[PDB]
Every structure is written in structure tokens, then in C-alpha cells.
Design an enzyme around this catalytic site. Structure first.
Site, short mmCIF file in Angstrom:
data_model
loop_
_atom_site.label_atom_id
_atom_site.label_comp_id
_atom_site.label_asym_id
_atom_site.label_seq_id
_atom_site.Cartn_x
_atom_site.Cartn_y
_atom_site.Cartn_z
N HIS B 41 -41.31 -115.46 -0.36
CA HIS B 41 -40.16 -114.77 -0.06
C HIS B 41 -39.73 -114.56 1.25
O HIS B 41 -38.72 -114.02 1.46
CB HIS B 41 -40.39 -113.40 -0.78
CG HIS B 41 -41.27 -112.13 -0.08
ND1 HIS B 41 -41.21 -111.90 1.07
CD2 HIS B 41 -42.26 -111.71 -0.66
CE1 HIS B 41 -42.03 -110.96 1.25
NE2 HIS B 41 -42.71 -110.86 0.22
N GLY B 143 -43.17 -105.14 7.03
CA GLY B 143 -43.68 -106.18 7.84
C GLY B 143 -45.15 -106.73 7.48
O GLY B 143 -45.42 -107.49 8.27
N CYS B 145 -46.43 -108.05 4.75
CA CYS B 145 -46.41 -109.13 3.88
C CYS B 145 -47.17 -110.35 4.59
O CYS B 145 -46.95 -110.57 5.67
CB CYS B 145 -45.13 -109.52 3.37
SG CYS B 145 -44.24 -108.21 2.42
O1 LIG Z 1 -41.85 -104.59 -1.93
C1 LIG Z 1 -40.99 -104.44 -1.43
C2 LIG Z 1 -40.98 -104.55 0.17
C3 LIG Z 1 -41.67 -105.88 0.67
C4 LIG Z 1 -40.99 -107.23 -0.05
C5 LIG Z 1 -39.96 -107.73 0.98
C6 LIG Z 1 -40.43 -107.07 2.27
N1 LIG Z 1 -41.56 -106.11 2.01
C7 LIG Z 1 -42.18 -105.50 2.92
O2 LIG Z 1 -42.06 -105.61 4.18
C8 LIG Z 1 -43.28 -104.45 2.46
C9 LIG Z 1 -44.77 -104.66 2.27
N2 LIG Z 1 -45.32 -103.58 1.83
C10 LIG Z 1 -45.09 -102.26 1.80
C11 LIG Z 1 -43.55 -101.90 2.18
C12 LIG Z 1 -42.91 -103.04 2.58
C13 LIG Z 1 -43.22 -100.69 2.23
C14 LIG Z 1 -42.06 -100.23 1.94
C15 LIG Z 1 -41.56 -98.72 1.71
C16 LIG Z 1 -40.58 -98.62 0.81
C17 LIG Z 1 -40.89 -99.26 -0.67
C18 LIG Z 1 -39.98 -98.87 -1.68
C19 LIG Z 1 -40.21 -99.80 -2.94
O3 LIG Z 1 -40.07 -101.26 -2.76
C20 LIG Z 1 -39.97 -102.01 -3.58
O4 LIG Z 1 -39.89 -101.67 -4.70
C21 LIG Z 1 -39.80 -103.43 -3.31
C22 LIG Z 1 -38.74 -104.29 -4.03
C23 LIG Z 1 -38.92 -105.64 -3.99
C24 LIG Z 1 -39.54 -106.19 -4.55
C25 LIG Z 1 -39.81 -107.66 -4.76
C26 LIG Z 1 -39.27 -108.39 -3.65
CL1 LIG Z 1 -39.70 -109.84 -3.24
C27 LIG Z 1 -38.48 -107.62 -2.60
C28 LIG Z 1 -38.16 -106.39 -2.93
N3 LIG Z 1 -39.67 -103.81 -1.90
#
Ligand SMILES: O=C1C[C@H]2CCCN2C(=O)c2cncc(c2)/C=C/CCCCCOC(=O)[C@@H](Cc2ccc(Cl)cc2)N1
Ligand SMILES: O=C1C[C@H]2CCCN2C(=O)c2cncc(c2)/C=C/CCCCCOC(=O)[C@@H](Cc2ccc(Cl)cc2)N1
Lengths: 306, 306
Positions: B41, B143, B145
Site C-alpha cells: 500500500h 507512519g 506501517c
Molecule cells: O489503517 C489505516 C491507516 C494505515 C493504513 C494506511 C496508513 N496507515 C497508518 O499509517 C497507520 C497504521 N497504524 C495505525 C494508524 C495508522 C492509526 C490511525 C489512527 C486512525 C485509525 C482510524 C481507522 O483507520 C482505518 O480504519 C484504516 C482504513 C484503511 C484500511 C486499509 C488501508 Cl490500505 C488504508 C486505510 N486506516
């Protein structure tokens, strides 16, 4: 989101860990430039530990009595001296992986990462608080002495703890890296007891702020209190006094959430008086006190090192 | 003595973490030999994430579209390919810090250490378990991932998790290092929910053995039970079914303590039925399920690595 008991990355400290053997005793040493630091009780026989004369025992040792091993490589000892309860072995080789470092003495309530080691090799890493009674609730076995506690302060490894002994209650005692014990403890096999321990109030408030940041709001009420009225309730439940200094260091978490410190004090007051209403906060059924205000900031901001 | 949630030393993994930038997106990569592993991604715009065709998106990219940084030093990309949900960037330099490593796919209930990273730099280390519903209860921000989960198996880093996403419930989802998701999740911004989570029964029993080893013994009765009678009680409290395979893996802790597995099951059965009556086990008011039988042996025997 999420909130875990999080330790500093251990790599910089792993590069400094060595094996120190004197007679039939082997424990861990910290190798920084051309000096190895370890507990002075390495020079004691079991009989010496009962009533040790460290000044006399050190003079009786020669450099040849000390075997220092950095992995499979032997480091030749060219000098030995004492600073309080820490033995300093000067070696003929400077550690090329010495990080930028400081020796700091931490206050009760401050947290640090422990790298637990055996035979100069790491076993694992975990977070500890200096308790108000100057003990730590560690995980340490026979051979763990000389394992160190540290923080990473920007670009600098701040060493704050070296492990010396376990009390019969099962809690742990040790020194700063100048060899001065935390609390009234001594490195000899004499009967010693820790004071009554108290809960670190500023840390409990920091952890409630961490819970709000992660979306937990059931414990928030519409009430507020004064510092004096909070402290009258706090003293009854064996909580440390909250000072004006404590209110200031919670300021950043109050800014982040928009919940005033004395509003969160009213919430904690209700939890102490009425309990947790069958619920958990960040996967805990009790109030956690081993996160400082800055531990919350570092984890919820994603602070990195190098 | 003492029992703490303990992580592996992170140093071997710290030496493998790099920064991967594609367009305006920066996340973390794992540098092993001349390959960098990261979530696919990374090639997506926020718009692409809504309905990505990764095969078409990657065709449009060149080797030059990937900026890989090992600290301040750029690594030239000479190849890009996809394995399931993991991107593999071939680089012109083999990592001189590559440890002995395996890629393993872990079972629900198995534990691992996470090195949480931002901009290819480490923030901290904590212990996690693969939940029965194939989520993990991490601590991860925007950030994070490409942060990895691992065990150290003798003198070998066994990589078991790469971090991909957070579900709206605030739990985490990701892949093995062959890019196969744990559970029914996809790397697309679509409506996704984890199944109802259950308690890891074998892990609770292991943690009670850890408590006995550390002298916490009040919960021990001399009641007997059968596996079938235990499971009829256990299933009512949302506990995973205990099999004869589970009984065998607890054998080593039974041998150490001289408490039969089905005797400890009788004690657990009483704790489920009657509660803790305002007492704690290893400083916890709830039954902990993120320690495996081997996690207890590792900590209580002082296992070290290399
Ligand atoms: O998973 C995330 C974001 C994650 C993936 C892209 C960059 N990402 C991070 O950099 C990250 C990694 N781990 C924790 C976070 C952020 C925390 C975030 C706070 C808000 C969370 C609200 C709910 O988010 C969702 O449902 C999905 C929705 C989603 C699912 C799958 C993808 Cl392919 C893209 C978006 N979004
Ligand atoms: O502190 C320990 C031993 C420790 C110190 C020498 C080597 N040591 C370890 O290698 C070790 C480090 N950390 C954890 C353990 C062992 C675990 C032990 C389990 C039994 C503990 C029973 C109660 O022990 C005591 O009161 C003091 C008594 C004592 C106090 C001070 C000294 Cl100078 C020597 C003995 N003994």
C-alpha cells in the site's frame, strides 16, 4: 491508537554488555570507552558477602584476577578501582560501539528500560519505575547483577540503574552508575527491608490522560476539585501527595485533551472512592502508576531516536 | 524472582529497519540481504486506497519511484515485485547487519516482540499476542506501517508479523513476511470487522504456573477435574477450547512445579466461578492470557541469544 508498556530500543546498550568473572563468580559489566563498570560484590566469596571489607578485598586482587569477555573476545584488565559500590576495570581496548551517554540519578516515580542479562548476553527488555520506597519490581535471577537501566534522552543514552540484589520480599535494589544505592540499602548479606510503598499519583493521572487519548471516556465526570481536597482523599488510599510541580508536567496532556488537571483529579477521586464499575482502562482492572507524563507523550507522539 | 511482560532485545532487528518513500508517502522497510520488504500500500494515493488494483498500480511505477534510506544513505532500487500483500525492493547493497533469520507464520495465542518504527527509526519495543480473531492489540500511529514482530529462536530472528492497518475498533491487522494477512482482512479502505475475540486458555494456565514459581500460591486448591468438565465451565466464560495438545505443552511447567496440568485446571475453574475476592496474581486483578508456556520458561530460566 493502542497503549502498551513500551521500552526504549535496546541496541545501543546491547553493544556495551560484557561478562566479568572473578574467582568462581561471573556477572555482567557495562563497557564504555576503555572502562568496564560492574557491582563491586563480584570480588567477594560467599563468606566475604557476610561482612565484606571492600577496600581490603580490592587491594588483595591483581588485574590478572579479573577475566573480562566481550562476546568471545577477552579484554585485558590494566587497572582496577572502586567508586562507592561500582568496580571500574580499565581495559587496553576502547569499545568502538560506545554510544553518546550520561550517568544520571533519577527521582522516585521516574521510569526506565531494563536490559536483563546473564553471562554478559541479553535475555530481554522491560519497563520499571523507581518506587517511592527506592526499590524496583523487576524480573531478575541468579547471575543478573550488572544488568543496567536507562532512558534515551534525545541523542544520549542516560544510564540510571545497575542491578545489585533482591530483597526477601522479592523486589530489587541497585545503584546509579556512580555506585550510590537508591534508598538505605548496602551490598552485604545483612537483614534489610524496604519502607512501605505508595502509589505514584502523577503517573496514575498521566495514564488516565493516555486512556482519554485512546478514546476511553466512561470515567470522566462533570465535577472539579482543589489540590488540597484531592490530596485529603489521596492520602487515605496510600497515594503520594500531588504537588504544583506535578500539575505543571501534566500540562501537555491537559492541552492535548482539553481536560483540566483538577477535573481529572475529580475523576480519579471518584474511581478511588467508588471503584471501576466492572470495567477496564487500557486492558487493566487496576489503576496503573508506572507511566510518567513524558512516557505518554513519547508513545502517543511516536518519538524516535537517531 | 518477579514476572514482567518481557520483550526480546531489539538490536538485531534495529540493524534491518529502513525508510521507504513513494510519492508523498513514507513508511518503514525491513532490509535482509539485498531485499527490502514493506507493505504494498506504499504505492497507493489516499484515492487509490479506496479501490486499489495493485497489479495495475505497480506496472505504472519504476525502480526510481522508490526512495530507500538506511539512515542518511540512499540504497539504489534495481527491482520491485509483489508477493501477496508485501512489496520486495531488490537493492544494489546487501545489509552487512543481516542476522540469521527465518520467515514463520504463527498460530493464534503465540506471542512476539514489536519494534514500533517511524521514518525507518525505532520508537520503542513491546510484547504482543496473535488474538484468536487474528487481530493484535498493538500501539501504532500514522507512519508505523512496515514495523515488524519477531521472536529470537536460539540464534535466529524469526519474523512473524508486518504491520499494515488499524481497524475502527482500534486493534491492528497485518501479514506474515510472505505477505499473507492473518485473518480475513484486505489492504483496501473497505468495511472490515474482526470476529468476536476469545481468551487464550493455555496462556492463562502458563501465567498461573509463573505465579507459583514466584511464590504466589493462594489460588491453588487440591480439587481434581477432567479436560471435558473443565471445557464445559471454560466455554461459558468465552475461553478457547483446551485440547490434549494444550495439556502436553504445559507439561514442562507441571514438571518444574510438581502441580499436574489438570490440578491447575481445577484451580483456574474455581477462579472463573468465584473470582479473585479482591486479591491479585502477580500484581493483576484480571487473568492474563498473553504469556505462552515457553515465555514462562524463557523468563524464569534466563534464556539468552547468540
Ligand atoms: O489503517 C489505516 C491507516 C494505515 C493504513 C494506511 C496508513 N496507515 C497508518 O499509517 C497507520 C497504521 N497504524 C495505525 C494508524 C495508522 C492509526 C490511525 C489512527 C486512525 C485509525 C482510524 C481507522 O483507520 C482505518 O480504519 C484504516 C482504513 C484503511 C484500511 C486499509 C488501508 Cl490500505 C488504508 C486505510 N486506516
Ligand atoms: O540479592 C541476593 C543475590 C544477588 C546478590 C549476589 C548475587 N545475586 C544474584 O545473582 C541475584 C540477582 N538478582 C536476583 C536474584 C539473584 C534472585 C535470587 C533469588 C533468591 C533471593 C533470596 C533473598 O536474597 C537476598 O536477600 C540477597 C542477600 C544478599 C544481599 C547483598 C549481597 Cl552483596 C549478597 C546477598 N541475595
Amino acid at each position: 491508537s493502542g497503549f502498551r508498556k513500551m521500552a526504549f530500543p535496546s541496541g545501543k546498550v546491547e553493544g556495551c554488555m560484557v561478562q566479568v568473572t572473578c574467582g568462581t563468580t561471573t556477572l555482567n559489566g557495562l563497557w564504555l570507552d576503555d572502562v568496564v563498570y560492574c557491582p563491586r560484590h563480584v570480588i567477594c566469596t560467599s563468606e566475604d558477602m557476610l561482612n565484606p571489607n571492600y577496600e581490603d578485598l580490592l587491594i588483595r586482587k591483581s588485574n590478572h584476577n579479573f577475566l573480562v569477555q566481550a562476546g568471545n573476545v577477552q579484554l585485558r584488565v590494566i587497572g582496577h578501582s572502586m567508586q562507592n559500590c561500582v568496580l571500574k576495570l580499565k581495559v587496553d581496548t576502547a569499545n568502538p560501539k560506545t554510544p553518546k551517554y550520561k550517568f544520571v540519578r533519577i527521582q522516585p516515580g521516574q521510569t526506565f528500560s531494563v536490559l536483563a542479562c546473564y553471562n554478559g548476553s541479553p535475555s530481554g527488555v522491560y519497563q520499571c519505575a523507581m518506587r517511592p520506597n527506592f526499590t524496583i519490581k523487576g524480573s531478575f535471577l541468579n547471575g543478573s547483577c550488572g544488568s543496567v537501566g536507562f532512558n534515551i534522552d534525545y541523542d544520549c543514552v542516560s544510564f540510571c540503574y545497575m542491578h545489585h540484589m533482591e530483597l526477601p520480599t522479592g523486589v530489587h535494589a541497585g545503584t546509579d552508575l556512580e555506585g550510590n544505592f537508591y534508598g538505605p540499602f548496602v551490598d552485604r548479606q545483612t537483614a534489610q527491608a524496604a519502607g512501605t510503598d505508595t502509589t505514584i499519583t502523577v503517573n496514575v493521572l498521566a495514564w488516565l490522560y493516555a486512556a482519554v487519548i485512546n478514546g476511553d471516556r466512561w470515567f470522566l465526570n462533570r465535577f472539579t476539585t482543589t489540590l488540597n481536597d484531592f490530596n485529603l482523599v489521596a492520602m487515605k488510599y496510600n497515594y503520594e501527595p500531588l504537588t504544583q510541580d506535578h500539575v505543571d508536567i501534566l500540562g501537555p496532556l491537559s492541552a492535548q485533551t482539553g481536560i483540566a488537571v483538577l477535573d481529572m483529579c475529580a475523576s480519579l477521586k471518584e474511581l478511588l472512592q467508588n471503584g471501576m464499575n466492572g470495567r477496564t482502562i487500557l486492558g487493566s482492572a487496576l489503576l496503573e502508576d508506572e507511566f510518567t507524563p513524558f512516557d505518554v507523550v513519547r508513545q502517543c507522539s511516536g518519538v524516535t531516536f537517531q
